[model samples]
Target: SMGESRVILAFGDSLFAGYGLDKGESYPAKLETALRSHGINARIINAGVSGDTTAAGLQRIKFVLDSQPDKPELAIVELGGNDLLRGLSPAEARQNLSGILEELQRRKIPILLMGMRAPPNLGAKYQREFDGIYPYLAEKYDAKLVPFFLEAVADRPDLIQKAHVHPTARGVEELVSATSNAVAKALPA
Candidate 1:
């Protein structure tokens, strides 16, 4: 028999929102399957907002946390995708993400940070700064981190949609496979 189910708050943008994917094909749904496959009995609540940036995530963070009926055992913070667009303010992204981490920490919820990387074309300075945000915050907050969760599927244009933004169902599965073990191991004993 399955044991007590663990609740994880999947908070992020389209990456987690299943933008182009079909019903139950979203990242959260796929991730739930992965966790259950490993006997985790995980019920992940998808709080992802498509096209959501770090600022918006910060604004809604508290409400989302408070809205969860079952207090989540873990919170997966995944945003900043849209913010890394043309403007590419690493500082602003850092500040907003820091705010998100603070809110989760305040609620005494453990975190699983989904790290996002800047495109190399953004120049070395931008790349270096943006690339460091996740690891830096992960260390500062002592949260679990999946370094570049999209690493496998990012380079494959075929796996991406026409918009070259969201992932297809196939890509989503790849992501689930990539990060499942890290997520499972991130839970507190």
Candidate 2:
């Protein structure tokens, strides 16, 4: 432990929950190990629920925060993928996430907004709108931004699972690696 322990809420969907992989292979688990290895005492709470949308996440944010044994020093917001998958309105998804961010801000909790890309098949306009959500929110709230959480695994079939939606264990490793720097930078010095 390098300093006082910090708690980070990994609040999002199946990606953070390690839907298809073992508990040890989850991003939160790998993140904890990586942070520890880097000499930071951190606890990343996995608050992910599979198939959850931004609206659903908005509904549960308070409960998740209140249920935590320790108040989180920071939170990683990763959502909107399921919303896009369901063809939900981008405006609604943005509203829900904005609500989540606002509440976190009200609580004085720092945040990292993790971006998710809409499928290319969704067409250019939809892609432009969906893809703009993260950076928009990040700028609106002055939060840290991870442009694409699945960037490392998105294009690599070998890194994904049989389901093709979730990443495999190795893919989680890649995610952890890609995300750790941003996460580390977001933490208090």
Candidate 3:
């Protein structure tokens, strides 16, 4: 292995994991490629888990950090969908996200907080809470923010998976391209 490559840990659910794409086509892998294309030599660590809720992701945070002692140069938090899926209160989700931001702040870890919107069926109150949590934490902690992770793919059935939740292969690539740019802009010199 290359000795001490710059690392970026992408922490999320199926989106970051690239649920429907081939191994090499996953977001993190594509992100690495994108970074290299931009002359930023960085290793993109895929810390995503299938079906992981915000709480579950929080539980695994230590393990993710432990996996590489080098300390990531950046982290992207892409959670909350599962929270909404389970009909959990948005307040609970916000707390989880806030706790995560606090912990990362303590470590002086730079972050890109990827936000998610609850389905309209969840009601305006929940949607507002869910959507507000991201910017609030970003401003509170000075973390970079990607307003909506699935902005391009969420409403496009053709770009989404059969379930209309996960992104299709094309959608995954699209996400990688967009998210990688956001990360690049957030990367520390």
Candidate 1 stretches greater than 4 Å from native:
164-189
Q: All candidates: CA RMSD in angstroms?
A: 15.6, 15.5, 15.5
What C-alpha lDDT do the candidate models reach, one value each?
A: 0.90, 0.91, 0.84
Which candidate, 2 or 3, would have the higher TM-score against the true structure? Answer: 2
TM-score of each: 0.83, 0.84, 0.81
Kindly list the per-residue Cα lDDT of model 3 for residues 1-189, writing each as its tens digit.
345568898999998888988869888888888887776888888888989988888788877887786798898999999998888977888788877777777888899989888777778987887788888888988999989888988768797667646666798899998899789889987
Q: Which residue pairs collide, candidate 2?
A: none
- Count clashing residue pairs per candidate: 0, 0, 0
Full candidate order by lDDT, most accurate first: 2, 1, 3
Q: Report the poorest 10 consecutive residues by lDDT, candidate 2.
A: 160-169
Instruction: Count backbone clashes in candidate 2.
Output: 0
Candidate order by decreasing TM-score: 2, 1, 3
How does model 1 fare in lDDT? 0.90
Candidate 1 lands at a TM-score of 0.83
In model 1, which residue pairs have backbone atoms overlapping below 3 Å?
A: none
